[PDB]
């Protein structure tokens, strides 16, 4: 061993075993919490909370956390909050000064920036207590107990802590939070008295931040990135963000538009949010009408329903599709029935039929004489996240030549209103990639084009995220310590804008998901200079 | 595309594409492992392992890892290790030189610092193999096979690798590990011969660390943070840490005190540690006594037990509560019975009753003729984490007007001794927040006060942790490269101390968990200067 | 509160609230994707894709991503891709210039470097769509739909983004990807027409990278680490990497060699890759032959099979082992049977026996008259990851004194060919540590020796990984900004090499897994200097 030590044993070297331990600026942090001023004026009387931060001792601040006291939900229907309820109820956030807006973000973009922060996401409300679809039995029954959720309003001032902090520069800072209508953050059946709930519900907010009391602060200018959103017209595959002079990134995604529907869906998995969870919740809801053990032909189904007695061999053939169903402990007086067309969709009477019953291979279970119901054991099916994301209105579409919804009255009563504001793609999990081509143009010249989502793969790799978006990043320079790298305009050559064009993929004219309306969302991060001369001021880089 | 590359094309610029690649200090790392010296003197003859580090070539060190050789557990009872068994058996760790203690930590605080390190936590012993509750059948049977567990003793010397490393100078460094009783790290039934196990069990430790052999080390002074904790009096909502002169943080949490009990609990979920897992383990244990299938009235239950035959409609009414129990394949000669008061608690006769049977709404299952038992299918219940965290001693408490434990002898035999040293709150998962208010005072002046756990929300956000504590951090300055920012005393004004006052929520005099004793835990991180002049020396900042 | 802000209120201090915001090098990033040139000119017509990056505008590059287009798999057998299919089909990657190879890696080492990057791993092909063992029913049936996977080729140029980027000193850079045969990345039964699949399968690659267009680049030299591996002779417990002059790390692991077998295994868990998942998949496959309900003695099993009728008390004794099997709803004309020796191994008659039936304690379930099969409720067993990792060839081994595979013809038909190239250890999860002692020698001198895998514990702790390897790291100096610390050679003493010796564990008294052939793997990271005098050049540090 000693011979290797002697093999170890003159150049100028950097000390990697000691540090010169520099003394920082003298400061003292403090967690400050303020109650706001609530306003409900004009646009559908929307809720706006205003917080004024004016202190001679608060020199700088960062890490904004908005808390919300959710009330006790009493009643008789089925009710649950959407996952991350705290983020979903934020429509817009705006930080301002005497000189105007310093930074502002749309609710969905704040969520998108925090999507990879599991801690922040939990805090906003991701619990079985909140997200499970609870049931009221009596008019005085408690559906949900009161709860407090915490929303981390991630800002550019948190990146490098004290270094990136917002300096107040002897000015009043006003944080303004615009809320989404409570209908958005709630999942309910028709049975629930939403009318009374909507009237009585009030957002109860409190803004908290980390304040810094700094002795002899030496302020210098900085740069900030402001996200700017462009939502295209319904089913328009283009968006243009004008006046692009110094952008650090460009993000592209799609959103479904459910305005052509009642926002009612057959099932929701609640707290369990995996792709398998959405599917299982759906299959579970259909099974009660799909396999019926009755004496004799089942009653209470539309005349359009084709309920067939299962043969001795257990195989029911629905055209090309074969469904094997074998139920144990069936009474001698009863028979096993299969609903041959629970949900079906067709463009013409001679067209291809999209039938949900055809999506089942094998159904096995045991009948309970005690509870007079079937307890399914093993199911073989080809159901997917797209089926679970079909608004019930699209099965009943004018475009559908058949009845479409052949379920029982009971099943239809259990349908849920889902108005989740932050849905992407055409499914609840944004699994299906509906973009075949992406084309970005700086002016009239093609800046980037792709077929596969390589820009999404890079976005996920570079940010270590499981939920990325097709993103072009122009800045690979360290934040705060350097002026960000940007795509830079040439007004003379008319390179004032970024135009995005997509080429969507298609399904059969016979799949209800074909009729889901899409909107293209383009997000641009513009570079701004922060000056602290006469209070806090921001200037667009040009 | 070329017009955009021409749109890209004199200011002083920082090179972001090249680096000057500076030569570091000449060193050679080495993984060194040492066997210690075991001592069992004085306080209940507690186990203390001592490791002496001194090598003409070891210049500096970091990343301490304690290996523990767990023996083969042979015998007849039910036995399991606590999750993260390696951390749980550490009572205290102390690094010291000829000049005295350099750094020391209480076992629970070392665990708290490593709670967000999933890798370190797995290494300490978190598996099906160690943490499941295993069963012995013969006196020579193997309950547990031998295993090695690795405990990462996180120190302030690992933060910035070689830069933050502990320099040994020429002094002898002594690492001293104080071990908790084996009783603490084991979960067992009464059937297990713990008496023989306790006598025969010996901690078998080995300390490993990364040692650096540095040629011509140039040592400079440093700063280190030392955690200091104060445990309040049983049930007292106050604690004070005296002599606070330069603290970087203050943390507040509570701990249950189970000294007033036998430390016996009805159930443990083993390796599965989710809130649902604790609850499911509990429900599973109760169900065997809760719904009985017998010919006729069930036998072998206390006279105080009220077992009722389930009516034809399947609904059994226990006062206000309605329990629906429908079991399939019941023999013709037998009936279904419900235990109306399995577990009961009352402080007064003909007054409020905490009844565990009332916590069930629906119970379905099928009777097995082959194994003469019920295989429960679906259970609707309101059992919580608190219920699963009630010691069984409290159900039998002298406060209790009722017998309380109306379970079978068989059920009671399956109860488990749990002595896990690192339990927080009043439940096994520290879910229930028992602090309504927190008030911190620097001297006589209020430094901070809160109602909601905002300080915990910030602690979780700032440290990216799922298991935070109400913490006030005063240092937001980068570690190692800067002198930490601290709350600084003014002895003249009497600002020598930090006094914590909480306000506890209450469960109610008729809830068995009301009788769980609490302890306030206040943790203060004091700033210290490290000098390497005459061996390693530390000096408290004042 | 104000008295504490006055308690806050001259030394030179570092500004922690402002930054001088330095302007970076003027650049513009771009995501570039190129189609390659496919070659199959030996050794065994192995597929080699070549990508040439020659651009007057591309100054530097990093973040290489290989996309592969997987075709539609049509046919009749059972087929599934291996988890992380994208990484598994890479045999070798080589980046080179006019001056030769700059950096190259063996496919397994690229995977090992990316094993802790969950995002990259998902992208390469980890999904129920890709990894589930799918079934074809007709010769025209679609087993797998077409899919695209993305393989992140992690290089030393991504570490510090633009700073660590590969500069192209106006030279053509050629990326060369060598592909493993498609057999390696596929899991199939005998029924599948692999012959036609292998003929028709073609790798369809596309290389993507982040190019940087830099104005007035100021290039400086750098250092790079190149992984180099040596695979020992079959069952030889030693390996030696020659010409070691400046290594930053040394890694040691073993690989099973399944060449002495048909690469057929009884079960695979598909997408579900937990240790429990592998075990459950295995137990599920054995159960159909383990507990038989027939009239009367079961038929279609080898004469060597010992199938016993389960007694009234339900307990069947297989020597020391007791198996309790209780099946419900068994017809009056039928009996319950237990296969006493489903799989048995021995190298000597009337000596030790490894019997898989003996690894079961209890088996319960209910017979379905409807599907004429047993639905197993609860199983008590002692089956582990090793048992699921034993090739069927070892049961049929010449050394085996018994028949070995006493399963039904049906069971044997469901066996799967697994040729996963990146298997470590002797089990599918590399859980079992088969090294009792490790000894590393730099020349003739012992550099390091250990018994337990402390080097693996440190590797996992230091890199924050769940799947580490026994690794000695010599560099603890920050990458890019410093010349890496290395173990240095002394050619005179013959310290030119690193010689590793291992003592494999006996793996138990009579385990078939002891006859799985092992290959000791040693990986060395050699330090290379990157120079740009004329084009891009590398030089091995000596």
Residue numbers in the entry:
A (entry chain B), B (entry chain A), C (entry chain C): 2 to 10, 15 to 547
From the publication, what sentences describe this entry?
Trimeric capsomers of the VACV D13 protein form a transitory, stabilizing lattice on the surface of the initial spherical immature virus particle. The crystal structure of D13 reveals that this major scaffolding protein comprises a double β barrel “jelly-roll” subunit arranged as pseudo-hexagonal trimers.
A mutant of D13 with a single amino acid change from aspartic acid to glycine at position 513 (D13D513G) polymerizes into flat sheets of protein composed of hexagonal lattices (Szajner et al., 2005), which do not associate with membrane bilayers but form layered stacks (Szajner et al., 2005), and irregular membranes are formed that lack a D13 scaffold, similar to those seen when the expression of D13 is repressed. For the structure of D13D513G at 3.0 Å, density has been attributed to residues Asn2 to Ile10 and modeled (no density is observed between Ile10 and Ser15). The orientation of the trimers within the PRD1-derived lattice matches the electron microscopy data and the morphology-modifying residue 513 lies at the interface between neighboring trimers. In addition, the mutant structure contains well-resolved electron density for residues 2–10 at the N terminus of the protein (not observed in the wild-type structure), which form a short α helix that precedes the long N-terminal tail of each subunit. D13D513G and wild-type D13 trimers differ only in the additional short N-terminal helix (residues 2–10) visualized in the structure of D13D513G.
